Each structure stands twice: as C-alpha cells, then as structure tokens.
Amino acid sequence: NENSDVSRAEEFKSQANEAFKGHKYSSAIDLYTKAIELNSNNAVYWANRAFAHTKLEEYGSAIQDASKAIEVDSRYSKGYYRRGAAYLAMGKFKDALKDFQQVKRLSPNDPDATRKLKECEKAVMKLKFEEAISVPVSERRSVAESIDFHTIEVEPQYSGARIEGEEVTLDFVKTMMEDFKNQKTLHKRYAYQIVLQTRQILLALPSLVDISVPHGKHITVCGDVHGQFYDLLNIFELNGLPSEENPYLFNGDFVDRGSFSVEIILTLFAFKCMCPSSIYLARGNHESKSMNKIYGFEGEVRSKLSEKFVDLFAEVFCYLPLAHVINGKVFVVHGGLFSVDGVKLSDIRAIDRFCEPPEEGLMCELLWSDPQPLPGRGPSKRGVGLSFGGDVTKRFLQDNNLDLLVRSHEVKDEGYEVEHDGKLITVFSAPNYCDQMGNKGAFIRFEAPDMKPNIVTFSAVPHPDVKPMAYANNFLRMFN
Ligand SMILES: [Cl-]
Ligand SMILES: [Mn+2]
Ligand SMILES: [Mn+2]
Question: Which EC number(s) are documented for this chain?
C-alpha cells in the first residue's frame, strides 16, 4: 500500500513549523501527527514532534517520538539528540550521556557533538558524587537544630526590612515585598526567622488540609507561579493581599524555572507566618530536591541566601501538605489522581509525606499526573506519573462526596481549562511562562456557600532583565 502522500504531509510539516515559530506547541504537535499519519518513514517528522513535546515539558512523549525517529533512520543524529535533550531536561543524565555518545559517533569531527559529550561526562560523575552522599531527609538532623535565628547579628548598615520581635507583621511583609520588587535583599536573620517559623506551622498540618470558608466569605485558588515574582505582585494588586478576610491557596510549584523564586517563597512563607489562615501552600513537583537542584531554586538560594538554606528549604518543602479540600466540596491537588481506584480522603490525609516524592505511590501520582480527554488511564506524557480520564475524576469525586477537582501542573493558553465535563479545572498563574509562552495566567475565586468557581484571567507584567533559568543547571540552560 503506497498510500502515503508526501506533498500533503510536507504541507502539515510547514504548518507545524509555523506554529512552532509562534510557540503554539500543541497545534504543532497536532500538525506533526497529521504529517506523520500521511508519512511515517520521515524521521524529521518524529524528531520535530519530539522537539515540540519537550517544549511543553512532555518528556515521555518526547522520548517515545525520538525513539521512533531513531527506528526510522539509524544514522539520523538529530533523533538521538532530541531524545538526549528530553532525558537531560528531566534529569536523566546517564541516558542523556548514552544518546550524546551516539550523536558524536555519527558526526565524528563536529565540535558541538564532542562538546556536549564532554559536558554530559562531567555531569554524570558530578551526579555520581551527589547520589553517593544522598541521605533521606527524615534520617538527618534538621537545619533548625544547628541554627537559632536570634544568634544572627544584623550589621547596622543593613537597609532592608527588619522583623522586630518574634511576630511577622503586615508592615514587614509590605516592606519586604517592596524591597524584593526593587531587587533588594533580605537579611539572613529574617530569612531564617521566616523559614524556621514556617517549618513549625507546616509540620503540624495533615497531608490533606480541610479549608473552611464560612457563609459569605471567599478564597482564591492559584496555580503554578514558578518564581515569577512580579506576576505574583500583579495577582495581589488585582485581587488583594493575603489576609484572614482574603485568603489564598497556592497549588504548589512556587519556585524553579523562573528567576525570582527566592522572593516568591519568602513572600508566601512570610504571609503564612503572619496569619496562617491567610494563605495555604500545597506542594508541587518542583518543591523537591530532585527538581530544585537543576531547575533554578537551589542555585538561586546559593546566590542570594547561603548554602544551609538549601537543605532547610528542602526540609520545609517536605513538610508541605499534599492536598486541600475547600468546604468539603472542592478538591485541590497539584498534579491529579491515581492509578488505582477507591482512594478516599483519609488515605491522602494519612500519607507520610515527610520525604522526597518517590517514583511510586500516591504521593508521586498526585504530584505528577495529568488529565486526558478520553476515559480510562494511560501512560504519562511526562514519563512520570500517569494520565487519567474523566471517569477517574467522576468516580473519585462521587466516592468522596466532592463536587469539583481543581489542579495545576500544566500550562494553559488562557491560564485555565475546564475538562472532564466540568468536573476538573486546571488553573495556572504564571502568565507568559518562561518569558516565551505568551499565555495568560488565571486564578479562581470561590465564594461560599454555593462555591461557584469564578475564574479570573490576567496577563504578564514587566520585570527586570533576569532571564529564566538564570540560576538553573548550566547544561539545561544551553538547550530549548
Ligand atoms: Cl511542573
Ligand atoms: Mn507542576
Ligand atoms: Mn508547573
């Protein structure tokens, strides 16, 4: 059957490349799929759809597409290049080393092939040391055990904000945010005060927090912000600062990727210190030593804070709750649902969350999952977690007497998308993601008692000339 039309397939490829130039990666993937359907022996099509997949952080789909590209042409170096870029993007340095070994073997005198190979060799042995000294955080002394914040002297020439006494006050938070806005810094004493007080608050919280919004009051659910501090300031300017009267739920992924991650996490933690009922912080996948070590937050901390804040921030992130339930009706996780059925809220509440997210179990799945339009389950596009359909959402909701599922974790054009017949809503509060996506951000206000989700969208604001991934892993920087 010679029924493949190369002309129509090349028409789809150019259309997909045009959508690629315009950062319309989902449309590009669709057009590459149509191109592949009409011609599956062109490895360039597979490599391009893989490239578009990595742009959407769909690294599993990327690896699979690049693998089919390699299957088509053994000597197509761009297939191995794309697969290794996807592996490198998700931290699998050894697999990246394999694919970049192959990339050099094909083009043997190309300077960049040997360069990326020597780069990956340095990275894998560096990772060998890092992995050899890896110890579970629950078997380690807390940083709080060896640092009392009252002991830290503040030199009189420090011009930034000061916490007088034990209490974090709204006046200090406003001064801290204005200093952060002008690219100033907070003293180590007050950073330690904030983070150590936050450690106290979070460790006494269950893994699933029941949030009670009484009759007539409201709450704002926010999605990923990934270190875009100036868009966080925009959210607060458009919707009001966190307060007992105007509470916030931030659905994980506060840091990494964006280059103002320290300022966000210090602002969010301080608001929690000031009035705990004024803000609720769920955990994301990027509140993890695995992610922060390579995606910017850890390097941002080492630059603006010190090296002990790295372990302290990791420990505090391990204490973050995994989920929230608003008025016993609205279920808010970051990632999604699970590979098994019959999971009740009691199961989530009882999770021993004080560890780095494993590669298996309820914790990993609720932090990494994505919804799919078709019913059922399927392999994760990210290679971590799973894809769950509308039947999974509906069963979980009726099983738990819940009305709605709210989640984030995935970028959206308008900052939101309603799926699963109005039972799942993705919310994403990082507009113009990575300074290149061009999307709007969004947040959802919930007013009691009827709990109708009032979605509000917003656009990005300017910020100082600090490029994304600035403090991130060097090798991950020189791609995209
Ligand atoms: Cl993410
Ligand atoms: Mn996420
Ligand atoms: Mn995210």
Answer: 3.1.3.16
